[PDB]
Design a protein around this ligand. Structure first.
Ligand SMILES: *[C@@H]1O[C@H](CO)[C@@H](O[C@@H]2O[C@H](CO)[C@@H](O)[C@H](O)[C@H]2NC(C)=O)[C@H](O)[C@H]1NC(C)=O
Ligand SMILES: *[C@@H]1O[C@H](CO)[C@@H](O[C@@H]2O[C@H](CO)[C@@H](O)[C@H](O)[C@H]2NC(C)=O)[C@H](O)[C@H]1NC(C)=O
Ligand SMILES: *[C@@H]1O[C@H](CO)[C@@H](O[C@@H]2O[C@H](CO)[C@@H](O)[C@H](O)[C@H]2NC(C)=O)[C@H](O)[C@H]1NC(C)=O
Lengths: 48, 645, 289, 215
């Protein structure tokens, strides 16, 4: 029961690497999603 | 043998100084003390510094300090409780205790140049970064700006090191924006779970040229008033001249969070000499509600909405007064500053907190105990009245009921409150107590306060009491501690305490004695009391006019701003039109709200006393542990226990 | 600007801390002035009324005022370069008078409007120049382009996913206006897969003082050692009692001190030093230690 | 305009000259400017031990206290100001000698009064504290106190305050009205037949200043 906890199983396995290809395309916006940013919002704005 | 003792607060904080007070009782000769802080659970060793020697020349006292670092290993767990272990080795005998830890590291205050902005305008904002002592600290801050439905649109990360705790920053509002309430949220890098916030509004406006004040005669309504609620209107231009116009005013009822409007309460009054007056009668209010009972109206609240237009017809201001209670009682009595624990057979002091129905403190209202009409007293400036009883040695709880005696008001209008106090439990029912008594005044820095220590015990053991041990808790840390010696026959001793600026806004004094009594058993008896201090600045910044004449200067004129303040201080400025504040005066920062935030961060939960010596320290916010075995109750919750209410 | 200003001052001292000063009020005023009260925004090419209010705060003197709306290339009115739009009014003392004018916006943007006034028989005058936004007809729309799920294991096959977003067709768009595209990403919070641990109510008995022979010292030390490790990882010391881990630490340290007393000189264990060494007990202590 | 070495004048004018042996004693120190006007917020301290310091209130009165030993010898009390920047030649001082209370037959049974020191306005309450000191064989015989108020040369109010055994301290609130202006004296006493069957009276008194205003 201690080893059942300690390193307890959990449903999270987030390891997402998401990148965007811009219309201006001077650089590629790239972020990462893990457990500490599971409920974190990531937003970007354009003017066109 | 002598008994070794360690006193510390209940809760320790990251990134701040923590006071550690070491004492030995009944000790002979010098005893070296080494100090160590470990982690909990397990052993990784987080702090191994500091040592001292308890000396009989110093009455075996020794205060040493330390600081808790935080790293990636400490900041790991963010959601659930974690603890550390304090180790102090007195000669060859070690005393240790597990302590609860808070992850908070200081305070963040955010000032904005306006409380409400237009699309396409600039927001100027300064973030003041202070520690728990309200002194400027240099740390990295994470700030975020969120939308009305909670979407972060702009975020920053910057350290205030070598900038004297000030982060001046800027951001431009786009014209493509959703109007409504916008929120700025901020937190330190090393404390991500402690989130600070302040709000502002985005709207499409132009500033008005005048302000409208809606003034109820009394800030409540008494249901059986045949005349009804009178609300005076005051309207004047922003530069201070009287407004001539016509006001349209309508009343309404607020029940919980939902507002109900009374349509036929509408009146139309001209505003003459900068003023008007409107009355909502008792018949119209009862005609508005469909419930003909006056008893069900109690507990709800009223609101007023006014719309005033000048007689030129070129400008318009809408004002609102809200939260006006419908009550049977023009006062609210609370035992919030009264301890719930009495000393049996020793007189007990009552501090009665009386407020107006909105929550503002009541001034010079006479209250009395329900038992015996002879004991009466009037409230002071802060709404506190002083009453006292002469307690019998009842081991049964003592019910205390206080009722006001203000003249002309009927008995249905006299407020009352009923509580039940609890008896102090001595060790082994030895009936040996400690009683504290003190003056009750508004305390300013620079005054002295006489602390009175009364001993109660049999005279066979009074010669064994040679000292008292006192400590001062202020803002969640130990500020001062020491010994007060006592010669035999001196059951009462007096200690003058000088008030400095460090004691603001409130502090608790604890005191105890110890001996081996009864059948050869170690006994600890303690007492505590909570004292309020007048809310003021630690420093003294004043802004005034340099010129003494040319009242109302011309637009664009040069004038001299005179600034008197503490030497070495950095001051920030902003000058705002008051018409912004007539539109939206919410979320304005002030010094009184700063001390209110500090008081909400206090770890003490009771105005003094306790069920025993352990309950005295635990309710004050202190931990004690002795080498003989007597120690405080375990506490694993940061917040205070909630009253039954 | 003619108003009373409220100045907020906050000081920061390295020894006297933060101090928010009491606000200082400065009333700036002129005896005769104009206040032109524009709306925040106006519809382009629709005739609108502006309200210029002129104030007289003499206690016993009414004033003859010539007030004039100036010519504007961005706003059509009666004011041209040849022919000016001027009026002659009279303001009673301790009173205000409003002079309406009518104008038409001609071009979009934050454009300039200027008015002036001057009194006869005294040389006191005022002028007000403000700017207000000329907005083309139309309204804000915040429509949604797409809302879809991202899962590279599920979509696109074998951990790689590609997905496009077309721009909005927006045929109702006002010509030559800004149009933001707000992109948002939020992960999926997944939790549970944890069963309940033992509530540590009846686990308060396993604290046993080690005593006796070497095997018997291992029997008494057996439930004390494992219970601390279980309560560490289940973090149930809140219900159990934080003081009892330090008390159990003394019993675990007392068990290990008593366990080393039955050690054979060839690093082996038995009930007594006289007894032949036990292979199973030697493996069990290594499991415990 | 005085030519002085001292910018202040220290007086024991509001301090009683008689102490209670073995029971702590209160000092009310009246400090003035050289013309005679009261000094505001000047810190004074006892000459013995630098730790006991206090600043004057609005009426020029500072509160100091000692923890007295049972000396039947008179006790010399010297008070010295501790105001910063000013030199020791500029620090005022005053020296007096207080006298011991004599109990009936040297029975060492005393009465001690103690009270708050504030500017008193009409409508405020004032807590009067009565401390009994005697052996416990005669503490059960003291069942009451007798108090009287002297104001403007006539008795204004008087009464009894009862006491139960074991309650050596009792508290009596006193509401201040306009009759107490400008100054009044409170006296209190108890009585019993103690020692070898002898009538004993023990009393104590204090003078209180009231804020000068209209009735
Ligand atoms: C368009 O923008 C509006 C804001 O201008 C948003 O709708 C608002 O949603 C909040 C709740 O979070 C309501 O309190 C407001 O009343 C809504 N505004 C309205 C209805 O004008 C949302 O982003 C978009 N809404 C629509 C209907 O398109
Ligand atoms: C704990 O010890 C420190 C020693 O650093 C004390 O600080 C000194 O206190 C004395 C007397 O109060 C002052 O005269 C010194 O100026 C202080 N030191 C410094 C560097 O300023 C501290 O007061 C002690 N606190 C307690 C509660 O005992
Ligand atoms: C002495 O006796 C007189 C009786 O004339 C008392 O005067 C009355 O006191 C009571 C209680 O204080 C009041 O309720 C009455 O209103 C008083 N009488 C009048 C006519 O006003 C007086 O208080 C007593 N004084 C003392 C010191 O005992």
């Amino acid at each position: 029961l201690a080893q059942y906890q300690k390193d307890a199983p959990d449903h999270q396995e987030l390891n997402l690497d998401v990148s965007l290809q811009l219309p201006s395309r001077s650089s590629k916006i790239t972020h990462r999603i893990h457990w500490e940013s599971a409920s974190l919002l990531r937003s970007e704005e354009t003017k066109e | 043998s002598p008994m070794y003792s360690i006193i510390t607060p209940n809760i320790l904080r990251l990134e701040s100084e923590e006071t550690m007070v070491l004492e030995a009782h009944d000790a002979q000769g010098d005893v070296p003390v080494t100090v160590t802080v470990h982690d909990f659970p397990g052993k990784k060793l987080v702090l191994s510094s500091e040592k001292t020697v308890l000396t009989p020349a110093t009455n075996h006292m020794g205060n040493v300090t330390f600081t808790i670092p935080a790293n990636r290993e400490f900041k790991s767990e963010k959601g659930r409780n974690k603890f550390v272990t304090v180790q102090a080795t007195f000669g060859t005998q070690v005393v240790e205790k597990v302590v609860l830890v808070s992850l908070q590291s200081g305070y963040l205050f955010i000032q904005t140049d306006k409380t409400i902005y237009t699309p396409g305008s600039t927001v100027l904002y300064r973030i003041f970064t202070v520690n728990h002592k309200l002194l400027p600290v240099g740390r990295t801050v994470m700030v975020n700006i969120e939308n009305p439905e909670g979407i972060p649109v702009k975020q920053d990360s910057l350290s205030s090191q070598n900038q004297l705790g000030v982060l001046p920053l800027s951001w431009d509002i786009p014209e493509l924006v959703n109007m409504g309430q916008w929120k700025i949220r901020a937190y330190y890098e090393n404390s991500p779970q402690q989130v600070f916030s302040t709000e502002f509004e985005v709207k499409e406006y132009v500033l008005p040229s005048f302000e409208v004040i809606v003034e109820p005669t009394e800030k409540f309504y008494y249901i059986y008033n045949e005349k009804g609620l009178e609300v005076t209107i005051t309207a004047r231009f922003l530069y201070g001249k009287k407004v001539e116009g016509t006001a349209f005013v309508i009343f309404g009822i607020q029940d919980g969070e939902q507002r109900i409007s009374l349509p036929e309460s509408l009146k139309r009054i001209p505003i003459e000499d900068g003023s008007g007056e409107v009355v909502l009668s008792r018949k119209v209010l009862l005609d508005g509600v469909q419930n003909p009972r006056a008893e069900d109206l109690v507990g709800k609240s009223l609101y007023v909405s006014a719309t005033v237009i000048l007689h030129s017809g070129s400008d318009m201001v809408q004002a609102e007064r809200s939260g006006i209670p419908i009550v049977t009682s023009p006062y609210q009595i609370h035992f919030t500053k009264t301890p719930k624990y009495f000393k049996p057979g020793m007189p007990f002091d009552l501090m009665v907190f009386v407020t107006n129905p909105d929550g503002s403190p009541a001034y010079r209202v006479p209250v009395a105990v329900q038992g015996e009409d002879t004991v009466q007293s009037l409230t002071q400036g802060d709404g506190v009245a002083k009453l006292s009883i002469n307690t019998h040695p009842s081991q049964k709880p003592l019910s205390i009921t206080v009722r006001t005696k203000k003249q002309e008001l009927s008995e249905a209008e006299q407020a009352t409150r009923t509580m039940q106090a609890l008896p102090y439990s001595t060790v082994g029912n030895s009936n040996n107590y400690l009683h504290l008594s003190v003056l009750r005044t508004e305390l300013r820095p620079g005054e002295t306060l006489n602390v009175n220590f009364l001993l109660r015990m049999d005279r066979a053991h009074e010669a064994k009491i040679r000292y008292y041990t006192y400590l001062i808790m202020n803002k969640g840390r130990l500020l001062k501690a020491g010994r007060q010696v006592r010669e035999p026959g001196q059951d009462l001793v007096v200690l003058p305490l000088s008030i400095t600026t460090d004691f603001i806004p409130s502090f608790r004094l604890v005191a105890y004695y110890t001996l081996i009594g009864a059948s050869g058993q170690r006994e600890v008896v303690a007492d505590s009391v909570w004292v309020d201090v007048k809310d003021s600045c630690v420093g003294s910044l004043v802004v005034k006019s340099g010129q003494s004449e040319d009242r109302q200067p011309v637009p664009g004129q040069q004038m001299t701003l005179k600034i008197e303040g503490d030497h070495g201080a950095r001051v920030v400025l902003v000058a705002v039109d008051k018409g912004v504040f007539v539109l939206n005066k919410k979320n304005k920062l002030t010094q009184s709200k700063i001390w209110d935030v500090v008081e909400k961060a206090d770890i003490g939960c009771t105005p003094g006393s306790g069920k025993d010596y352990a309950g005295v320290f635990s309710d004050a916010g202190l931990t004690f542990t002795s080498s003989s075995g007597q120690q405080t109750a375990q506490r694993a919750e940061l917040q205070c226990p909630q009253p039954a209410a | 600007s003619i108003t009373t200003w409220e100045i907020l001052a906050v000081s920061m001292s390295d020894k006297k801390g933060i101090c928010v000063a009491d606000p200082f009020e400065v009333t700036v005023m002129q005896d005769f002035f104009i206040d032109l009260r524009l709306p925040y925004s106006v519809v382009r090419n629709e005739q609108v009324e502006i309200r210029a209010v002129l104030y007289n705060y003499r206690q016993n003197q009414e004033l003859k005022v010539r007030v004039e709306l100036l010519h504007n290339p961005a706003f059509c009115s009666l004011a041209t370069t040849k022919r000016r739009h001027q009026q002659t009014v009279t303001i009673p003392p301790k009173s205000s008078l409003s002079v309406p004018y009518v104008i038409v916006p001609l071009k979009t943007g934050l454009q300039e409007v200027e008015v002036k006034a001057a009194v006869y028989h005294h040389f006191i005058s005022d002028g007000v120049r403000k700017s207000l936004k000329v907005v083309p007809e139309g309204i804000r729309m915040n429509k949604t382009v797409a809302v879809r799920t991202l899962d590279p294991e599920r979509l696109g096959r074998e951990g790689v996913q590609k997905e496009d977003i077309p721009p909005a067709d927006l045929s109702d768009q006002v010509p030559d206006t800004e149009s933001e595209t707000r992109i948002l990403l939020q992960g999926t919070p997944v939790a549970q897969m944890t069963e309940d641990a033992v509530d540590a109510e009846r686990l308060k008995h396993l604290i046993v003082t080690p005593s006796g022979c070497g095997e018997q010292n291992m029997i008494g030390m057996t439930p004390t050692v494992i219970a601390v490790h279980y309560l560490d990882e289940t973090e149930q010391w809140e219900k159990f009692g934080l003081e009892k881990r330090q008390g159990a630490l003394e019993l675990i340290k007392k068990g290990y001190t008593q366990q080393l007393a039955f050690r054979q000189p060839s690093s082996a264990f038995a009930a007594f030093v006289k007894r032949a060494p036990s292979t199973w007990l030697t493996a069990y202590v290594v499991k415990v230690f």
